[PDB]
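Entry: Lysozyme C
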Amino acid sequence: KVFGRCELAAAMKRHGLDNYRGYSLGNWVCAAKFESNFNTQATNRNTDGSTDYGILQINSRWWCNDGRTPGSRNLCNIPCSALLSSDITASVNCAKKIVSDGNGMNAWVAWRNRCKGTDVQAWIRGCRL
């Protein structure tokens, strides 16, 4: 599924992401835009044998089990495939653990490269939240 910008913002606010750990909704919508372009099916294979899954591109090496990642840990206790659902619940709950893992949103390289320090409020423009 491909979320519209405001449709995703609403869904994220609904799952408690706005201001979570001090990160405004704009930050999350922006991270999702550059990590997967709002595509819940997005997957990126890495050269280290791991794969990033879903709307927030969660990595299989530590957060989910895809059964094909060497020395992988399943800290979110879920199959990576559940992160490819049209329902973002799984991704959000897992993301909530990642953002609290000692690096803030720096855990998402796309957020760091394209959202950090910018006027992230713009990503919520036109949204009736």
